[PDB]
Design a protein around this ligand. Structure first.
Ligand SMILES: [Zn+2]
Ligand SMILES: [Zn+2]
Lengths: 259, 253
């Protein structure tokens, strides 16, 4: 008994240098931080603490288009521990160097942590809203998680979000101006903003509801204490309640806060 | 209905300058390539071909000792899980003197991994034709080629073996005196590869933990080191169980 020709052959092969042609670096090196939640199981009731240890990841810089504080579309090749979806499309957002000069120094980084936080605030409301809303209401609005990202080559901080593709429309804006809903999906969205104002007892109001269907993005959270006093008012003058505001049993907006 | 103080607070603090301190990503990310097989499930009758794609894997350095100079490391994450995550792996580089004797370090590597696989293949065959009498089944680990970005260089990666490590023979016919079965089989296998390969090859430097070996030395006859083993190897009861002719004989009778 000895080694077949097949065997003898494969072994002799190894003895000599076999070819080695490594495909080149398909992508750009990046590190990403996330806003961690105490108990995510119950979003609304949870403390938001930033992460200290950044995950290494890689993203291929797809387009040369900066749509706008613009944003770029990039592809996530690999993500450490799979924070980002290794194999899906993300949006990289950032602000203008001028809207930055309008400050607080080293602005860029902060600005991003704030936007990611503002969005998390919306998410908490959303979670709370969907958590205690009559089973009559079919659609549940939702915001995707936003991550802090740090580019090395470009050397700058960005906010990253799961990029969605589909029918994108604006349900209302930080001016108080809203659209006249048609489908029920449209109604719920518009009622939600009204809701946040009630729930938070006039403390906050989520505006700029936009996105594709149920999945929302780039909202705008407003505090009563411009956008603070103004937007909160226009919205109350402008807003037109609907089927949901009824079903949610929410008091009219345009009325006296002393009765 | 309204909202509690918990949420009121969490929600409000989210609107407040929460603190952010960037710790430097721990450990370094590297690129690993492997020696693939056209039929992994039959190492002996399968062709080996290097891969072109280098999947990323993050590792954490632990040790720094030079026991070819090696180093202990822990895989924390690997793309498409090329490296078992949360597993210790060893990274060996080449002795400074051993390297300055031929871009070469990269080749010095692709060769040693190529080498171990041949041994790996030979073991698959051995374990295949092995009688029921020989229970222990020698095994070689799979080695990978990786590229450190920081240290800017290439190295080999093998899983860390736990347990008492010992060497049964070396590339010089120097072999231990079997104190138990295992050792007999380990000494035999070497003899058996020379028989199986028809004197073409000899696997020496049999070392590792238990039946799990590593870092072998494979000799090709042209054949001087092959001389020693022929003179020095003493057949044990195993060589017999495998019917391995007496190495010290005539090649033309
Ligand atoms: Zn309403
Ligand atoms: Zn023998």
């Amino acid at each position: 008994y000895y080694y077949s020709a097949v065997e003898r052959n494969n072994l002799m092969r190894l003895s000599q240098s076999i070819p080695f042609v490594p495909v080149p670096p398909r992508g750009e090196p990046v590190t990403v931080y996330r806003l961690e939640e105490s108990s995510p199981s119950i979003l609304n009731n949870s403390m938001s603490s930033w992460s200290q240890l950044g995950l290494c990841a890689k993203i291929e810089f797809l387009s040369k288009e900066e749509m706008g504080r613009r944003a770029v579309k990039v592809l996530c090749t690999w993500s450490e521990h799979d924070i980002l979806k290794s194999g899906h499309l993300y949006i990289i957002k950032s602000f203008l160097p001028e809207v930055i000069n309008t400050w607080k120094e080293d602005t860029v980084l902060h600005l991003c942590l704030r936007e990611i936080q503002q969005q998390r605030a919306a998410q908490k409301l959303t979670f709370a809203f969907n958590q205690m809303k009559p089973k009559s209401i079919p659609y549940s609005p939702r915001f995707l998680e936003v991550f802090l990202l740090y580019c090395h080559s470009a050397g700058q901080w960005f906010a990253v979000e799961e990029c969605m593709t589909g029918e994108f429309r604006k349900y209302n804006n930080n001016n108080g101006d809203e659209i006249i809903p048609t489908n029920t999906l449209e109604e719920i969205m518009l009622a939600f903003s009204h809701w946040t104002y009630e729930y938070t007892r006039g403390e906050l109001l989520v505006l700029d509801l936009q996105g594709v269907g149920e999945n929302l993005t780039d909202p705008s959270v407003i505090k009563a204490e411009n956008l603070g006093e103004d937007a909160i008012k226009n919205f109350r003058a402008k807003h037109h309640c609907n089927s949901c505001c009824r079903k949610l049993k929410l008091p009219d907006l345009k009325r006296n806060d002393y009765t």
